[PDB]
Amino acid sequence: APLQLGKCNIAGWILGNPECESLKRSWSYIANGTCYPGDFADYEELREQLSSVSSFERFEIFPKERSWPKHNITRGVTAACSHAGKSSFYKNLLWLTETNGSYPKLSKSYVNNKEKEVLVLWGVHHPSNIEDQKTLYRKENAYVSVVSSNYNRRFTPEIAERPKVRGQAGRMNYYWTLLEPGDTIIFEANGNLIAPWYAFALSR
């Protein structure tokens, strides 16, 4: 039987758009997208990845309140993702910002210790201007590094004046990779990382 996303699409569901329900289960096919504007890398491949699963589990990959002691985990909400008439954010990601005047370099790793695949999603924030970049990340030049046994990318914030989309001039790109059992993913960044908070374990 199909997975019913109702008002949402796969992007809004899998990122955790606050308007979208967060779920083990299975389905044969899949029947509010990104509340923050941006590009979703490999989106159609992800739709196909998720099209039929035999067990699916949402799990807290990086516990929000215990993982990021040198960064701010609470101001990272936006009117673009509002909920209960208040600013909010994707339920599966975490918008890290500076604390105490600094955004130190972070380094965070996860090993898939399960006996099935793990789907990890993250984002990179692209401010519209350099003043907002400095306000949030305390430096004009930042990087996000994501490495696993078969994935290696370094992301550079693209700062540029852009049309307002859903009220926002900034953007947020979304990315993902899969981890087989025993594979390790490492996040390194000194700004702009929208960190994993919940990830997914699934089987084909």
Residue numbers in the entry: 50 to 72, 75 to 82, 89 to 261
From the paper:
In addition, we also solved a 2.0 Å resolution crystal structure of the refolded head of A/Fort Monmouth/1/1947, which appears quite similar to the lower resolution full length mature trimer structure.
HA is a homotrimeric glycoprotein, with each monomer composed of two regions: (1) the head, comprising the receptor binding domain (RBD) which is crucial in viral attachment, and (2) the stalk, that is responsible for viral and cell membrane fusion in the endosome. Mammalian IVA infection is initiated through HAs binding to α2,6 sialic acid-linkage galactose receptors on the host cell surface, before entering the cell via endocytosis.
